[PDB]
């Protein structure tokens, strides 16, 4: 009945800034299981970045972005917040959430671009 995923926080910024990404959800019974965050480069590839899930104290990261990006889930507002710091210039790619309610639901709404 018109299920909705809302993304916010992105934009254009220079190198060395800070952004606060978001992924708001509404209209699900459970909506916890295993959520992700990943990039989508203009060179056709896609690297999985961060994940928070039902454990909460376990985050699966990559090697290049290891220990530098902050992930946080709000179970009350049904929103996962993504804080990113020391933004490298290779961030022209689109960065969005991959919520999972048993099957993977996704959106596309950001314009993350770092000069």
């Amino acid at each position: 009945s018109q299920v909705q995923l809302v993304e916010s926080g992105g934009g254009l910024v220079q190198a060395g800034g800070s952004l606060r990404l978001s992924c708001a959800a509404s209209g699900f019974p459970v909506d916890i299981t295993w959520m992700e965050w990943y990039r989508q480069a203009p060179g056709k590839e896609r690297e999985w970045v961060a994940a928070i899930y039902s454990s909460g104290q376990s985050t699966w990261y990559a090697d290049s972005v290891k220990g530098r990006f902050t992930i946080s889930r709000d179970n009350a507002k049904n929103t996962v917040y993504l804080q990113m710091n020391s933004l490298k210039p290779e961030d022209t790619a689109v960065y969005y959430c991959r919520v999972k309610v048993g099957a993977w639901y996704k959106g596309q709404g950001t314009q993350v671009t770092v000069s």
């Binding site: 299920v3 019974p29 048993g102 099957a103 993977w104 996704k106």
Partner: protein, 379 residues
């Protein structure tokens, strides 16, 4: 009454079938000649080379402009009366699923007509039975092995959506399948992914994993997962060029040239003997003959030699087959179980143990049961 010569002409064309089967069953269990890894070598050959060149020889010789259209209706009336009653069962009862609908359909209205049915009925009612038994082989390889192929895809395309979209199954528009997938089964991990659009439209993409919908949507996902299962099946390339040559040849009276006709007749003559030799190897790879139990093996010979023929005895008074055509229509339904309905149940795992019993146990009683129907119709 009958003669003793008619009993002899049956044994002339049924004894060379069992000789080609006992030598296959003996040379594995008794003398241990073939390794069971090497046993897959012959079963690979018969499925690809012998049979699709054998079915091409019967279809491209059968006249399409003189098919007995009255006999062809009273066999398309068995497969509709049985198909109408089973869908009345799976949608009104309290325990009727679709996993029992197809299995109770392959046991009743799909005999073994090509390999075993043609030489038996040719040795019982002259040579015009040898033309009628080809006219059913054409319809099985072009309709009734295709309508059954949709019923396994619809069995699969319902599970993958109902398992993983239980809450918002009603607002999906298009479904996109990557070309890696050949069978949405659960054999492969099948990471399912769903795009979200603005106004409730919801694109769904089915992928490969590393490390109810509208009826205008299910009738697109199925037709993609049938076109990928039909251009790989070699028998679909046999019956396509068989009908196309037969519509050309029997109008302008063109006879097929001897350079091509003898090029196919060197493999097609190696098709009927090897098929009974490949089937004889199959009845020794199993651990037991009766696998699922003695309470369901007799159920196989209850929906095949009784409910099979006796529904054509009432589907032949309606169309108007009397005399000699009535006896040939009843006997061709009491033939043992075909092998192509097993091949489907082995891939999709829809009861492989029942159809593995009905083929092997069906062959061992196929002779002393149809001979009872030859006597009781001759009086």
């Amino acid at each position: 009454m009958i003669t003793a010569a008619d009993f002899y002409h049956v044994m002339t064309a049924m004894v060379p079938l069992y000789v080609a089967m006992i030598l296959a069953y003996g040379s594995v269990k008794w003398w241990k000649i073939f390794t069971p890894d090497q046993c897959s070598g012959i079963n690979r050959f018969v499925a690809l080379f012998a049979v699709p060149l054998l079915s091409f020889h019967f279809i491209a010789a059968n006249n399409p402009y003189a098919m007995n259209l009255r006999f062809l209706a009273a066999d398309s009336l068995q497969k509709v009366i049985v198909l109408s009653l089973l869908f009345l069962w799976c949608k009104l009862s309290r325990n009727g699923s679709l996993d029992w609908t197809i299995t109770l359909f392959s046991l009743s209205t799909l005999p073994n007509t090509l390999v075993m049915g043609i030489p038996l009925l040719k040795g019982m009612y002259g040579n015009f039975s040898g033309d009628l038994m080809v006219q059913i082989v054409v319809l099985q390889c072009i309709i009734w092995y295709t309508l059954m192929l949709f019923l396994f895809e619809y069995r699969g395309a319902k599970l993958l959506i109902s398992e993983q979209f239980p809450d918002t199954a009603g607002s999906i528009v298009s479904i996109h399948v990557d070309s890696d997938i050949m069978s949405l089964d659960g054999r492969q991990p099948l990471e399912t992914e769903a795009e979200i659009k603005e106004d409730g439209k919801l694109h769904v993409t089915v992928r490969r994993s590393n490390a109810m919908p509208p009826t205008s949507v299910m009738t697109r996902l199925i037709l993609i997962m049938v076109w990928r299962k039909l251009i790989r099946n070699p028998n679909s390339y046999s019956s396509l060029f068989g009908i196309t040559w037969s519509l050309i040849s029997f109008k302008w009276n063109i006879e097929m040239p001897a350079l091509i006709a003898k090029s196919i007749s060197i493999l097609s003559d190696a098709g009927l003997g090897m098929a009974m030799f490949s089937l004889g190897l199959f009845m020794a790879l199993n651990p037991r003959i009766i696998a699922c139990g003695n309470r369901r093996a007799a159920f196989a010979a209850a929906m095949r030699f009784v409910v099979g023929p006796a529904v054509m005895l009432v589907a032949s008074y309606a169309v108007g087959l009397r005399g000699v055509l009535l006896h040939v229509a009843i006997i061709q339904a009491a033939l043992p179980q075909g092998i192509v309905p097993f091949v489907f149940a082995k891939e999709y795992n829809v009861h492989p143990d029942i159809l593995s019993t009905a083929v092997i146990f069906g062959m061992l009683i196929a002779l002393p049961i149809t001979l009872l129907y030859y006597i009781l119709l001759g009086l």
